[PDB]
Symmetry: C2
Subunit: 95 residues, 2 copies
């Protein structure tokens, strides 16, 4: 929640992954869309539920770009990871 800085916010390795993920997004998303992503990640880290985060990601990315959601795994803390895997399986995205 908002009162807890999560593992990925404190991990240099996860941060390297975040920076590269953002560069990767440029290939499929517009600048305005990447702004929405940033807003969504910020909302999640600020306490939005994992469900709310996932639903908003899915509607932003759309069916044709949902594969990009796999790359968010490192930013999901332990408590929310099973929910996130469930989400990925539900929308037909898998490694």
């Amino acid at each position: 929640g908002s009162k807890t800085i999560s593992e990925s916010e404190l991990s240099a390795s996860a941060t390297e992954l975040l920076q590269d993920y953002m560069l990767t997004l440029r290939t499929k998303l517009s600048s305005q869309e990447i702004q929405q992503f940033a807003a969504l990640l910020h909302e999640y880290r600020n306490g939005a539920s994992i469900h709310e985060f996932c639903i908003n990601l899915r509607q932003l990315y759309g069916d044709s770009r949902k594969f990009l959601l796999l790359g968010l795994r490192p930013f999901i803390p332990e408590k929310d990871s099973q929910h996130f895997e469930n989400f990925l399986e539900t929308i037909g995205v898998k490694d």
Copy 2:
């Protein structure tokens, strides 16, 4: 503060946040660290640098003002001048 700033993208800044959180343990209670965590999250989500500074000063209090200096690597360049102005105003510079 909508964009993910250079500070949030920087592996070294993240390492320093971990280091700073370990520092906080020696000076703040768990509840106070919860307050810090919420403030950083609100700043990152959209709170102004001025709002962040004002709330941190209130949280830390006079005797822990020196800790604010450790926030430097988490403040993106765009907010740096304001942050430094704040530090000088409260006399920690």
